[PDB]
Write a protein that binds this ligand. Structure first.
Ligand code: ZN
Lengths: 51, 172, 400, 59, 91, 310
């Protein structure tokens, strides 16, 4: 019988679990990419220097 | 913490008094060391403290006797050096603290070091007697052993950070 | 009394042009009368800035009453400069400042209190040394002092850091600063019993370029190979880029530890004590007695570690023959050590006093061990990063 | 000899040790890691002693 | 594939259970039994042994990966040393 | 317009095709406007090619100062990286294709050479440097379009270089990239023989707004796949060979860093220069990054599958 409250409450929770852990990896990647940007950035800077 | 806090304070005491500090400063340093079970730096201090001003702290005399014991660690004699003087504010309020530290310490000794333990062992270790020992094995969940005294002390993103650091290293 | 009007000139250099020879001229006679105090009276141009070292060295110009109560008063007074305006420009007159600090060390080790200079002056030291508790001149001084007042913890901030970018700064430094300071470190992590750290210290000091002989080097040899045998399981091998003159000079001098490693191989307590009486001089020489008990500790190390992987559990009286357990009951205190001194995967089978080897610490099967690996990672990553930076810098070299 | 084995000499029996791949690998791994790290600072300080141009003059 | 497929699917499912509450859709037992078993088994695969061996994975992987990174570390070490040899090492 | 560059002005394109600016300066072509067909089957047919080297005709055009790769990809063939002018033999592809491509309004004509060195690149080796040089004296505008499949596997970026090689008589001026790359024993010597005879084109990419929306919507249901890599399972004992190769990859460095020859340099043959340590460097980087692949894959799958929430 009428479970709607619990079930409806519930979908997001599971989603949250994946969302949180997956996000953590995501940001770690993001920051890593940011490092990529600085690394490539500095690489480009040296490129500019060579001319 | 009170152990570490008081010991650092007594350190500053010795540092700023002169290597000539207060004899109760000395006994407090040494008692705090033994609270931390210090045996070598305590011996530095003993080889770094004025022995005249040491004996000025006869409480420190007993404290260095106790440090000798903790250097040897025959237990009833350790507490007898303990139970020679019991001086509040330089000795005894951390005398109790150190007998309790020894309680947990020789407690793990019983548990982990002793597969089986003689109740006389921890009866010496902090003074907790053999019937106290039965109570303790029963309270922490440790098997008693009668007729032998071989009582049984019962032994009781983040990863994406490291991985993106792998990458950032290779992808420097 | 022409030692008065230097305040105006220093104001004409402090907050002005050069301060280096401003601080290292006092010219002035260099051995003066009360005017030294009068230079101490009127030499501080603006404040207790860089030039107040001038006032300090002028007070040194006497060297009469060196560590008299000024040994604390001027001490804090020096700390005044060391605190007020020691400045990152500690090194206008680098070597002069260094030797002056050594003069402080001279007077104090001489007289009264080798206790409290550490933080009182490491203010300006770090105003000189940058990152890794980096050895400028006064570090030999400081470890000297804490060796007098045997409290080595306060320099353990400086000690435990295996310093790099060491602030020799090409002046205000001597090779004996390294020598003294790192034999200090070896001594301390001997007493501290981080013997492998001293092994590192003395192996570096010996493989460091050298031509002479020294009980600096001889005792580096000493505590190093003590680590190799007393600490370590048995004889350390010859390092890679060792100095020539050792084999030239000090290696033939090394009969002490020739017989050391020999008798260590021998496992003879009698010849142990014989070599002990042999080098009882070095036993006594620097409060370093008990080296024989150290070698005996290494003996029991050899015996035990031997029996470790070979057995699971043994009779202590039988192993009283094996390790020299002195009967199972002295072996009882020994097993005490085993579970005690971080010595065995085993517990007190006190029913039979049995001691079962396990060696079951980790498969890194706890993530905290994984983070052990992680800090391994931290070290090696920043290590490679500085390798790249320095590789750059050799590229930064002016080529051709 | 070939002894990949153990003996509780209290037991009076031999007990062939199983050849560890995983944690023996861990052993050697962090062993060489510590060796490399010691030598890391070591070579840093050797680069120092060579750049600092320090040699123990005989006299 | 499963992940983001059912990601959009279950975003739909959140809107969709809001509808089955109500929406159109009336109160819905399809949602009830079906998504009940689904979500209230979740987070499924969150078991122990299982994640124990997951960390065993992680140990071996981080091990060998940092092994290679150590190799690269001592690599750049030798790089610097060779530039040294070029400019500095006179042997 | 976003579609302004997708406009294949066969008029304009074939105009600059017959323009011959390279015969005036062989460094005119600085850009390489590409449509992602290059990436398309270049990528998945170097990867689907296993390790079998390939060759042929690229679709494309020219715009301003720009070579344009409308197409590049692989064969199910071999022999490239060692064939005497390999690429030619696949041009029969758009010996037909482009022709009746014009029947749909693909009035383009043939422009280049599709290819792939599955596992170790897309380029022209020693004998294919005979290929590359001969053909750029044969076929200019000609390019050494260079991207490595397994490098783009363990790298996460498309190192695309349109390498108009410097024809015989024309040396690298100010701008000769000459992308040095770790070559097998077969062609490293001839790369040293010809490593500085080519420059790269400024390889840009052109598309439509529908293209961006399609890739975003791709991700918008591929993220589920993202948390199912599911990367460790793919190379179970692969890495063993990798490891057993990688240390030998490291012994690569050993191979070129082992030697007793004192003297002044490499002073006998190119070694050269202390050596192959850079080879093992790229080796360690790629292999630890594929470990990163496996671990992030399985671990983040745990992060989402095993436990997120109820
Ligand atoms: Zn060819």
């Amino acid at each position: 019988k009428k479970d709607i409250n619990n079930i409806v409450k519930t979908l997001h929770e599971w989603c949250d679990g994946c969302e949180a852990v997956l996000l953590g990896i995501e940001q770690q990647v993001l920051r890593a990419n940011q490092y990529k940007e600085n690394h490539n950035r500095t690489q480009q800077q040296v490129e500019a220097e060579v001319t | 913490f009170s152990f570490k806090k008081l010991l650092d304070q007594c350190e500053n005491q010795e540092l700023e008094a002169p290597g000539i500090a207060t004899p109760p400063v000395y006994g407090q340093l040494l008692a705090l060391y033994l609270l931390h079970n210090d045996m070598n730096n305590a011996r530095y201090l003993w080889k770094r403290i004025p022995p005249a001003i040491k004996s000025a702290n006869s409480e420190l005399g007993g404290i260095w006797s106790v440090g000798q014991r903790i250097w040897q660690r025959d237990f009833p004699g350790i507490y007898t050096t303990i139970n020679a003087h019991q001086w509040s504010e330089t000795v005894q309020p951390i005398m109790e603290a150190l007998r309790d530290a020894t309680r947990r310490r020789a407690f793990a000794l019983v548990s982990q070091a002793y597969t089986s333990i003689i109740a006389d062992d921890f009866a010496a270790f902090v003074g907790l007697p053999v019937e106290e020992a039965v109570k303790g094995i029963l309270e922490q969940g440790w098997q008693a052993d009668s007729t032998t005294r071989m009582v049984l002390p019962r032994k009781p993103e983040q990863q994406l950070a490291r991985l993106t650091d792998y990458v950032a290293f290779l992808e420097n | 009394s022409a030692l008065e009007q230097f305040v105006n000139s220093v104001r004409q250099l402090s907050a002005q042009g050069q301060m280096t020879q401003l601080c290292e001229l006092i010219k002035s006679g260099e051995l003066l009368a009360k005017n030294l105090s009068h230079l101490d009276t009127v030499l501080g141009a603006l404040d207790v800035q860089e030039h107040s070292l001038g006032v300090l060295a002028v007070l040194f110009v006497k060297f009469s009453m060196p560590s008299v109560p000024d040994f604390e008063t001027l001490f804090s007074q020096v700390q005044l400069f060391i605190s007020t305006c020691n400045g990152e420009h500690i090194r206008y007159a680098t070597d002069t400042f260094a030797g002056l600090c050594h003069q402080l060390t001279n007077a104090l080790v001489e007289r009264k209190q080798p206790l409290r200079g550490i933080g009182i002056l490491k203010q300006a030291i770090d105003k000189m040394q940058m990152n890794t508790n980096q050895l400028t001149s006064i570090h030999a001084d400081l470890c000297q002092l804490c060796l007098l007042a045997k409290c080595f913890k306060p320099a353990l901030p400086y000690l435990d850091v295996d310093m790099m970018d060491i602030c020799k700064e090409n002046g205000a430094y001597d090779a004996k600063h390294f020598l003294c300071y790192y034999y200090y470190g070896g001594m301390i992590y001997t007493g501290l019993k981080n013997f492998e750290r001293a092994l590192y210290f003395y192996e570096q000091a010996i493989t460091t370029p050298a031509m002479a002989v020294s009980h600096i080097m001889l005792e580096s040899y000493k505590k190093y190979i003590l680590v190799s045998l007393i600490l370590l399981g048995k004889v350390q091998q010859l390092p890679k880029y060792t100095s020539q003159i050792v084999g030239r000079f000090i290696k033939p001098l090394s009969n002490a530890y020739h017989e050391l490693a020999q008798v260590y191989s021998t496992n003879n307590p009698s010849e142990l004590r014989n070599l002990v009486n042999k080098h009882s001089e070095t036993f006594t020489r620097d409060n370093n007695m008990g080296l024989v008990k150290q070698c005996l500790s290494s003996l029991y190390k050899k015996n035990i570690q031997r029996l470790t992987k070979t057995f699971l559990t043994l009779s202590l009286q039988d192993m009283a023959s094996r390790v020299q357990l002195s009967g199972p009951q002295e072996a009882e205190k020994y097993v005490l050590h085993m579970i005690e001194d971080g010595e065995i995967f085993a517990s007190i089978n006190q029913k039979d006093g049995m001691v079962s080897f396990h060696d079951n610490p980790e498969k890194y099967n706890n993530p905290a061990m994984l983070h052990n690996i992680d800090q391994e990672m931290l070290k090696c990553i920043e290590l490679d990063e500085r390798l790249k930076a320095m590789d750059q810098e050799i590229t930064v070299n002016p080529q051709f | 000899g070939l002894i990949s084995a153990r003996v509780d000499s209290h037991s009076k029996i031999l007990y062939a040790r199983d050849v560890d791949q995983r944690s023996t690998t861990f052993e050697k791994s962090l062993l060489m890691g510590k060796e490399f790290q010691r030598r890391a600072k070591a070579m840093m300080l050797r680069a120092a002693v060579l750049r600092n141009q320090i040699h123990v003059k005989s006299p | 594939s499963a992940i983001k497929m059912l990601h959009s699917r279950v975003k739909l499912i959140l809107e969709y259970v809001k509808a089955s509450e109500a929406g159109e859709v009336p109160f819905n037992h399809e949602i009830l039994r079906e998504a009940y078993a689904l979500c209230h088994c979740l987070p499924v695969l969150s078991t122990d042994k299982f994640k124990t061996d997951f960390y065993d994975q992680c140990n071996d992987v981080g091990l060998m990966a940092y092994l290679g990174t150590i190799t690269k570390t001592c690599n750049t070490m030798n790089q610097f040393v060779n530039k040294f040899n070029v400019l500095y090492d006179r042997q | 317009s976003i579609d302004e560059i997708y406009k294949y002005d066969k008029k304009q394109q074939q105009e600059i095709l017959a323009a011959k600016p390279w015969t005036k300066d062989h460094h005119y072509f600085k850009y390489c406007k590409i449509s992602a067909l290059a990436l398309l089957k270049m990528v998945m047919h170097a990867r689907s090619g296993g390790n079998l080297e390939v060759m042929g005709l690229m679709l494309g055009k020219v715009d301003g100062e720009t070579m344009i790769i409308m197409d590049s990809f692989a064969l199910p063939v071999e022999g490239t990286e060692t064939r005497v002018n390999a690429q030619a033999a696949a041009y029969e592809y758009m010996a037909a294709y482009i022709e009746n491509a014009k029947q749909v309004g693909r009035l383009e004509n043939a422009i280049g050479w599709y290819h792939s060195h599955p596992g170790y690149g897309c380029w022209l080796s020693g004998i294919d440097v005979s290929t590359q040089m001969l053909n750029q004296q044969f076929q200019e505008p000609f390019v050494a379009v260079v991207i490595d499949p397994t490098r783009t596997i363990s790298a996460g970026k498309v190192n695309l270089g349109a390498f108009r090689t410097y024809p015989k008589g024309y040396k690298p001026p100010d701008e000769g990239p000459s992308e040095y790359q770790t070559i097998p024993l077969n062609k490293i010597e001839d790369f040293g023989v010809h490593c500085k005879q080519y420059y790269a084109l400024e390889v840009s990419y052109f598309k439509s707004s529908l293209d961006r929306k399609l890739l975003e919507l791709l991700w918008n249901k591929y993220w589920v796949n993202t948390l199912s890599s599911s990367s460790l399972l793919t190379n179970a004992d692969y890495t063993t060979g990798q490891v057993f190769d990688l240390s030998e990859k490291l012994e690569q460095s050993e191979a070129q860093l082992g030697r007793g020859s004192f003297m002044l340099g490499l002073e006998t043959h190119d070694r050269k220069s202390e050596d192959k340590l850079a080879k093992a460097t790229r080796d360690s980087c790629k292999t630890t990054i594929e470990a990163i692949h496996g671990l992030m894959s399985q671990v983040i799958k745990d992060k989402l599958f095993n436990q997120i929430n109820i």
